[PDB]
Ligand binder design. Structure first.
Ligand SMILES: Cc1ncc(COP(=O)(O)O)c(C=O)c1O
Ligand SMILES: Cc1ncc(COP(=O)(O)O)c(C=O)c1O
Lengths: 430, 430
């Protein structure tokens, strides 16, 4: 780091300027560190397992740009593919071959998708998917789950006789909010009751098949199968939001891992290799409702752009190498076990969850299966642990409500260094 | 081209595969060529004034990837900036200095913006801006104009006692559609009447200050001033959608060119240098309603990403060079005059419009000021002209309802070659 005497002078100067120019000094709320306290650091560059801030501090990174960097940051094969594409021009406004190869790859790896449509973010993917579900079924109501996050389309900015939704943000019309119904994740009986009451009127049910936006909460055995059965029984479309789980929980996503066939899936993150890229897909007959094949309108001027296709295709090639996910799932297990041991040694109660290359650390003695258990955790203790880990050179997600991520750049020495850091940081946070 | 005996064999093979994998074979509807007939070509690369298709055919390009390429395709300064950024990693998930520099640049060049927020598309920018207008005013109704296009947020997918909106797409809830009111562009009296009837309930009025999505239709003298006066009188926010006009009509946008101060502006296209990038901005007090500074929620995982910031900043530097827009405005005038002369020589009635580096060609004898005049044009004659121009090696927007674009790569010989092409193509299309 620039100072020898965790100096954050350069980040502080940038953040002070940013606060005058961007709401909260950031372009996405979580970046402002308001959940953990303090000020964020500004990043100079990222490479392998590491972030390097503008003050010269290096952090082992378990955020991975929020999921895309499953092969680590700045992977040379992804960088080479991107550099090659840049020489052809950054955007065309017309089709390119990379869009066909991308569609071939997603549909082959996630066969519930016979057809896909690229967009520019997870927000665009999910707002398109629910419009497709409404337009294909002729119904208005959408079911989502408390603790899941799908982006900021207005129909998602809603909370719970008929349990009509109410907005969670100003600027979201009340009438529209009534059409979004919210269930508790992992609650079999609540899902059954809602479909018994109004299943005929539900266009679609959207879920993170493994929750990542209330920390990492895996589904109970049979739970996703239960939701699939309710949707099929009642004529609603099952929408898996695999923006985070896709290509990360398993090569074929959470739907492969748990053996579910959704009607629609949304994708993002890994499929863009680090660049802005979303997608939605499903059976051909359903997807042919989308313009210009059918009447349901959705468009995007920069969608399918060639640099993003090249970056995502390079990452998708890497994740298809034999044993990729088994390796990362073991590394994730190793990290979680080491965190539990480090916390036990310090006398701090924690538990962990994990599915493939995503994990959750929880400040509790309970095995977390529900949003209520995630929120009953010792949030101030997490906040102290986060800052103590930063001081040890490890960047965890700055929130008790965000899953963490392993990458193939987290080699044995990186994992061990993370555990050495946790051994001290749990004692700091006790 | 690969064949010596406009072969499109390679595009045809790609398009046939794409039709099985993407709705309509495309990731954005206009790309399917359904308005003009025939099949689109697939692009191999883009450079300067030219697109090169996968069959080896070169086209002088007046689409410019729909607006971003105001300095031409593959500009070496933009490419250098992007390559430098790629070496630092493609995405961080945390703030970078480029986001601060981008905000400084937009707010300096477009001073109605004291604060901005980056997003990933024009669709995200405008759906955020209308949520901000609703949340800041406590009102529900949004006014838009027939022929303007803002992206596919559900509140925009609407058509016209109280003139309650109705959806234009399945999947868009009827209740929500009633909150969007539609006026005719350039109609002073209709705007006055709507505010007299329900101005107290209008949160925001959004407009392309120069229409580009019904071909290029400039505002009548005083029209934008009239809308500004109505909004201020009634407490509604004036939202300029400058996704297309920003940095293109003038350095300071259409709002500088016509001397208007909107309450909110949306940006895109040029500000990303070819990469997926949108923004919205306005006065600080208003923008501080946006999370995490205020309660109005909007987020984006990949927003402000460093490669996109570097590409956009490189383009914004180029467009600040002395005389940039005056030069392109003259080139645009020269092209339009040459098109009029080529058409007159062929006995075909056309007129043109232009503002800065955007223009419209119309198959009519009328000076187009209204959507009704744009739609009264000879659309089949345009379609014949489009295909004849393709055959002459010129790619115009494949729609009678899209503005065209000049770039600094359209040198004198490029413009002259375009006119030589038009001299034959107007005769083909007569
Ligand atoms: C599962 C999931 N879906 C959707 C989103 C929204 O995606 P974006 O921020 O790219 O709009 C996120 C996180 O932001 C997510 O984790
Ligand atoms: C003025 C304007 N605003 C918004 C949009 C939508 O932007 P995007 O396709 O990036 O979502 C477009 C065109 O698509 C546009 O021309």
């Amino acid at each position: 780091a620039h100072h020898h005497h965790m100096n954050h002078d350069q980040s502080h100067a940038l953040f002070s300027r940013a606060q005058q120019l961007l709401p909260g000094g950031v372009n996405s709320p979580v970046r402002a560190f308001k959940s953990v306290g303090g000020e964020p650091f500004f990043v100079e560059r990222a490479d392998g397992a590491y972030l390097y801030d503008v003050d010269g501090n290096r952090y082992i990174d378990y955020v991975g740009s929020w999921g895309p960097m499953i092969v680590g940051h700045n992977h040379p094969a992804v960088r080479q593919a991107v550099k090659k594409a840049i020489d052809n021009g950054l955007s065309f406004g017309a089709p390119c071959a990379g869009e066909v190869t991308m569609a071939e790859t997603i549909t082959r790896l996630v066969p519930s998708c016979e057809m896909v449509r690229m967009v520019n973010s997870g927000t665009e993917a999910t707002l398109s998917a629910i419009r497709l579900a409404r337009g294909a079924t002729g119904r208005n109501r959408i079911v989502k789950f408390e603790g899941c996050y799908h982006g900021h389309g207005d129909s998602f900015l809603v909370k719970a006789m008929l349990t009509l939704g109410v907005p969670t943000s100003p600027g979201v019309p009340a009438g529209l909010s009534e059409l979004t119904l919210t269930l508790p994740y992992n609650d079999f009986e609540a899902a059954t009751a809602l479909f018994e009451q109004q299943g005929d009127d539900i266009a679609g049910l959207i879920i993170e098949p493994v929750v990542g936006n209330a920390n990492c909460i895996p589904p109970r055995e049979g739970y996703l199968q239960h939701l699939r059965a309710l949707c099929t029984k009642h004529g609603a479309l099952l929408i898996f939001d695999e923006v985070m789980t896709g290509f990360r929980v398993a090569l074929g996503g959470a739907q492969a891992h748990y053996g579910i066939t959704p009607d629609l899936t949304t994708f993002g993150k890994i499929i863009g290799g680090g660049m802005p890229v979303g997608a939605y897909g499903g059976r051909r007959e359903l997807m042919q409702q989308i313009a210009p094949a059918g009447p349901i309108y959705q468009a995007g001027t920069l969608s399918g752009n060639p640099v993003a296709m090249a970056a995502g295709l390079a990452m998708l090639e890497l994740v298809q190498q034999p044993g990729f996910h088994a390796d990362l799932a073991e590394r994730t297990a190793r990290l979680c076990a080491g965190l539990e041991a480090a916390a036990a040694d310090a006398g701090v109660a924690v538990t962990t969850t994990r599915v493939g290359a995503m994990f959750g650390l929880f400040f509790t003695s309970e095995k977390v299966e529900t949003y209520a258990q995630a929120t009953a955790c010792d949030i101030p203790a997490f906040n102290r642990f986060f800052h103590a880990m930063l001081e040890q050179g490890v960047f965890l997600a700055p929130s008790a409500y965000e899953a963490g991520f392993l990458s193939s750049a987290h080699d044995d020495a990186v994992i061990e260094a993370t555990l050495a850091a946790a051994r001290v940081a749990f004692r700091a946070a006790k």
